[PDB]
Amino acid sequence: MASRILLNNGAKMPILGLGTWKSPPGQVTEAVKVAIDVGYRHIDCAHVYQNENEVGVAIQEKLREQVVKREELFIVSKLWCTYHEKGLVKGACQKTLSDLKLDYLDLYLIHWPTGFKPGKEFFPLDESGNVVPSDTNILDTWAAMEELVDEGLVKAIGISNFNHLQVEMILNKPGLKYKPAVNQIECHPYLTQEKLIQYCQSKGIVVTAYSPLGSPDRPWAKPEDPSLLEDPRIKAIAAKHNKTTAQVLIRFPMQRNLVVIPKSVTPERIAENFKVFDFELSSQDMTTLLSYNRNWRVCALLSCTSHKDYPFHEEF
Ligand SMILES: NC(=O)c1ccc[n+]([C@@H]2O[C@H](COP(=O)([O-])OP(=O)(O)OC[C@H]3O[C@@H](n4cnc5c(N)ncnc54)[C@H](OP(=O)(O)O)[C@@H]3O)[C@@H](O)[C@H]2O)c1
Ligand SMILES: C[S-](O)c1cccc(CNC(=O)c2ccc(F)cc2OCC(=O)O)c1
Numbered sequence: 001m002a003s004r005i006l007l008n009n010g011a012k013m014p015i016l017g018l019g020t021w022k023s024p025p026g027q028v029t030e031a032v033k034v035a036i037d038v039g040y041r042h043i044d045c046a047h048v049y050q051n052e053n054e055v056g057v058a059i060q061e062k063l064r065e066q067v068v069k070r071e072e073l074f075i076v077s078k079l080w081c082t083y084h085e086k087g088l089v090k091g092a093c094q095k096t097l098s099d100l101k102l103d104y105l106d107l108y109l110i111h112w113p114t115g116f117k118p119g120k121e122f123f124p125l126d127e128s129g130n131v132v133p134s135d136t137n138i139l140d141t142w143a144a145m146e147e148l149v150d151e152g153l154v155k156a157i158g159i160s161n162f163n164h165l166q167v168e169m170i171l172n173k174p175g176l177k178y179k180p181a182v183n184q185i186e187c188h189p190y191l192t193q194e195k196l197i198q199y200c201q202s203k204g205i206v207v208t209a210y211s212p213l214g215s216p217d218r219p220w221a222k223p224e225d226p227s228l229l230e231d232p233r234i235k236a237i238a239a240k241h242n243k244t245t246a247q248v249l250i251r252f253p254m255q256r257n258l259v260v261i262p263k264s265v266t267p268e269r270i271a272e273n274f275k276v277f278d279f280e281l282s283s284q285d286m287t288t289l290l291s292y293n294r295n296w297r298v299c300a301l302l303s304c305t306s307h308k309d310y311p312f313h314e315e316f
C-alpha cells in the first residue's frame with residue numbers, strides 16, 4: 001500500500017514510524033541510524049522521553065551522510081504537560097528543535113490534554129500525591145501551537161490522548177486557525193478505538209496508533225496483564241501469513257488508514273517491523289483482530305484521574 005497519508009495541512013506523513021519512548025539514551029542513536037538505513041522516514045519523539053538529544057545525533061548524522069534529505073524525513077515531537085502556558089510553548093518547542101538538531105518539526109502535538117504546574121518536575125505533586133494542574137485552558141494552548149506554525153517552527157500541529165469531546169472542543173474553538181492534523185492515541189487489538197477513530201477520520205484528522213505491540217516494556221507492567229505478542233490467536237494469524245506477530249500488529253492499524261509507531265532498539269526488530277508492505281490481512285482477519293478489544297490501556301495517566309481534563313472518563 002501507499003507509504004504516506006495526506007494530512008489536512010497538505011503535507012504527506014509516512015504511515016510507519018519509529019517510536020522512542022523508553023529507548024535508552026545509549027542505544028537510541030544507533031536505533032534511529034539503523035531505522036533510517038532500513039527505510040524509516042518518520043520518527044516519533046517527545047521532550048518527556050529525555051532522549052531527544054540522542055535521537056537528534058542520529059538524524060543529523062544521516063543528513064550529513066546524505067543517506068536522506070531533510071524534506072524526506074517526518075519528525076514528530078510533543079509539548080509536555082508542564083508547558084501548556086502561552087509564554088512557555090515557544091521555548092519548549094525550541095528546546096526540542098535544538099535537541100533534535102532541526103530547524104522545524106513536521107508535526108508537533110499537545111502530548112496530553114492535561115496541563116500541569118510549570119517547573120522542573122514533569123509530574124508536580126502536592127503533598128498527597130496528586131498532580132498539580134495548570135489553569136491554562138487547552139483552547140489557549142491550541143492558540144499557542146498555531147503561533148508555532150505561523151513562525152515556521154513546525155509544519156503541522158496536532159493533539160494526543162484527546163477524547164472525542166476534547167477534539168470537538170478544538171474543532172469548535174472560536175477563531176480556530178489551524179485544525180489539528182493528527183490525534184495520536186493508544187490503539188491495538190485490546191483497545192481498538194472504533195468510536196474515536198471514526199470521529200477523527202470523519203473530521204479529516206489522521207489518527208496515529210501508539211503502543212501497537214502492547215508496550216511490553218512499559219514500566220508498570222504486571223505479570224497478569226494481557227500480552228498481544230503472546231496471544232495465540234494473533235500468533236495463528238501471523239503463522240497463516242508467514243509473518244511475525246509484531247508484523248501483523250503493525251499491519252493491522254495500517255489497514256485501518258492509521259499511522260503506526262512501533263518502538264524498538266533492537267536492530268533486527270527495527271528491520272523486521274518495517275517489512276509490512278508486502279502482505280495483506282483479509283477483511284476477516286481485520287474483523288477478527290478487532291474482536292479482541294477489551295478496553296485495556298497501557299497509558300492511563302493514573303496520577304491525573306481528577307484533573308479537569310483527564311481524557312479517559314468519557315466513553316471515547
Ligand atoms: N502520545 C503518547 O502519549 C504516547 C504513549 C505511548 C507511546 N507513544 C509512542 O508510541 C511508541 C510505541 O509505543 P510503546 O513504546 O509504548 O510500545 P510498543 O511499540 O507497543 O512496544 C515496544 C516494545 O516491543 C518490543 N518489540 C518491538 N518490536 C518487536 C518485535 N518485532 N518482536 C518482539 N518485540 C518487539 C520492544 O523491544 P526492544 O525495544 O527491546 O526491541 C519494546 O519492548 C512509543 O515509543 C512512543 O514513541 C506515545
Ligand atoms: C492518564 S493522565 O492524563 C497522564 C498524563 C501524562 C502521562 C500519562 C502516561 N505517561 C507517562 O506516565 C509517561 C511518563 C514519562 C514518559 F517519558 C513517558 C510516559 O508515557 C509515554 C507517553 O508518551 O506519555 C498519563
